[PDB]
Symmetry: C2
């Protein structure tokens, strides 16, 4: 079976890599405006439109395609087979009986759309209406893997009625408990709100993943897996792979601003908590949807070799001091497409078996 | 758990029933024209009204027999919708729950349906599905198909051969009938080999799916062809099935060959075949709902030792189903067993 991946670190044999061609800007409503701190909202709301329909600037796609090519060259030189997803018509509008949008998004972030659990690929029930058909660019690959023995399932496709979103939402106060824009109307989650450690999987609630979605995944995986939910302190939370990143058995990288290490699930007590260094560096781009914590979005080729971004000099040094072997790559041109190395990949085959590590 | 159904015959406790409200006529192209003896046109209100009346008496019969009957949500079938690759003028209706979902034990599976107009047909059921999930049910979807032009043979002509191609997995749930650890299915104008193979893999830990060969050139759904009525008793359509070519495993069962109806349903709009009389619903191993004009079937079931419960339902036929099509048995009292 060509699909076999149980965690983030077993020796990487085959990976799907995203594509920035034909990419359309994120839509501001009703989710993504809440990924901006209030002081960034003014600039972002000029750039991003209500329901999509605006392409990424061609020059941004071109520069990102160049760094993507170098990233792929590194992967191949390190012995990984790379499957390049082909663009499709993200510019096209689509509609359901209840709502319509002006375009899709893009295929830059395979990690958001699918979970790989052992020999199974699961299509996520995504809360973002503009991403309703994002699996389409991958269906050639999925049908190939299914023909060769992979399991392939979907969460029920959500309706995404207005009831799924809190239109009175406001960020909590500094004291108050966390809260996000999605409601409990129906199950939704993005796959990248989860990271995989064999029989134990860690997730978070976010602006796209609600309790019903987590409950759905726990029931789907209940025979063999346990899902543990962390609390993020990031008010803009959307995806966990700049917050909590397993690197190897017994080693987990944690964001010091988004995680209170003293409130982490107790199962993590047997592991070494590697607290990420501060980057002292804000990436810049003509659209600015960056978080400074993009440096945590690393990709493990095995328990030792880790791809990390060239300007993340503190992360590179910490990884070396922690015993890893960083392989550096320029990749900040990918950040406006809302991912770095981990977001940009789906690790469909890592050599290994299902174990418990805690 | 409230969802618990392993076959077509264990004592029936809870059922979802279809609705004809807001129904849009079926679209001819590219599937349905090959199944008769892009939408946007409603069913005549008079046709809906008469069907609604007979539907209410069917529901009354079920409730009088101790069954809990759940009704769906009224939704906008008139609305158009579109994907990046295609658009349609409307949906269809919620008259046929049996087509849209498969109930396998405690799991409800949403079918990957080949008919573009039925892409959102699960929407009328989602309040119930979320209730059952909240109460412990498993709830899964086959990957939602793209339904590109490549999925259909537009130059199709009757010869077995069907309109759906092998571009991607598609099936309608009603192309399968359930016998505990063994399930019977068929290829049809909407269910292809990739679709069957998907379901076989999804259910491989506990179930075996046996494929029969339909002789019906218009084949669409198996529940007028092959109908398990009780352990060791299966009703077979003599025109659609060669009894000598049935799966070897059926050797140990009694094959009950359906009588000929000598009756063509009379309606202004006639889209189902004369074999609609096989589309019966079992309330247990003995009580069976059967349509009032199907006098040969009523007599045959009686002689075979069943207890027919008669109901007028021909006004539902223009909506492309009868009793089995119009229901989804979510709970029958029983466990998973082998019957072969």
């Amino acid at each position: 079976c060509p699909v076999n991946s149980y965690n983030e670190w077993d020796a990487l044999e085959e990976v799907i890599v995203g594509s920035v061609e034909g990419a359309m800007l994120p839509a501001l409503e009703p989710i993504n405006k809440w990924t901006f701190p209030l002081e960034e909202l003014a600039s972002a709301q000029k750039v991003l439109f209500e329901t999509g329909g605006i392409p990424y600037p061609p020059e941004m796609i071109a520069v990102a395609h160049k760094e993507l090519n170098e990233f792929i060259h590194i992967l191949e030189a390190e012995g990984v087979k790379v499957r390049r997803v082909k663009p499709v018509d993200f510019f096209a509008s689509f509609s359901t009986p209840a709502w319509q949008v002006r375009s899709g998004f893009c295929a830059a972030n395979p990690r958001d759309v699918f979970l790989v659990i052992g020999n199974e690929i699961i299509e996520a029930p995504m809360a973002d209406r503009n991403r309703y058909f994002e699996a389409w660019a991958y269906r050639d690959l999925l049908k190939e893997y299914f023909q060769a023995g992979a399991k392939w399932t979907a969460a029920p496709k959500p309706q995404l009625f207005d009831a799924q979103y809190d239109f009175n939402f406001q960020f909590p106060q500094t004291g108050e408990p966390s809260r996000f824009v999605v409601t409990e109307f129906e199950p939704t989650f993005d796959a990248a709100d989860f990271v995989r450690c064999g029989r134990d999987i860690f997730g978070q609630k976010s602006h796209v993943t609600n309790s019903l979605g987590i409950e759905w995944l726990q029931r789907h995986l209940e025979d063999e897996y346990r899902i543990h939910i962390i609390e993020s302190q990031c008010p803009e939370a959307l995806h966990i792979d700049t917050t909590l990143m397993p690197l190897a058995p017994g080693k987990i990288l944690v964001n010091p601003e988004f995680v209170d290490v003293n409130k982490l699930p107790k199962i993590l007590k047997s592991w070494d908590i590697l607290v990420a260094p501060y980057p002292n560096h804000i990436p810049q781009n003509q659209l600015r949807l960056v978080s400074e914590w993009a440096g945590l979005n690393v990709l493990m080729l095995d328990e030792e070799r880790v791809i990390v971004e060239k300007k993340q000099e503190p992360m590179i040094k910490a990884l070396k001091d922690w015993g890893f072997k960083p392989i550096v790559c320029s990749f900040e041109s990918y950040y406006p497409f809302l991912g770095s190395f981990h977001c940009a990949t789906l690790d469909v085959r890592r050599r290994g078996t299902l174990q418990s590590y805690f």
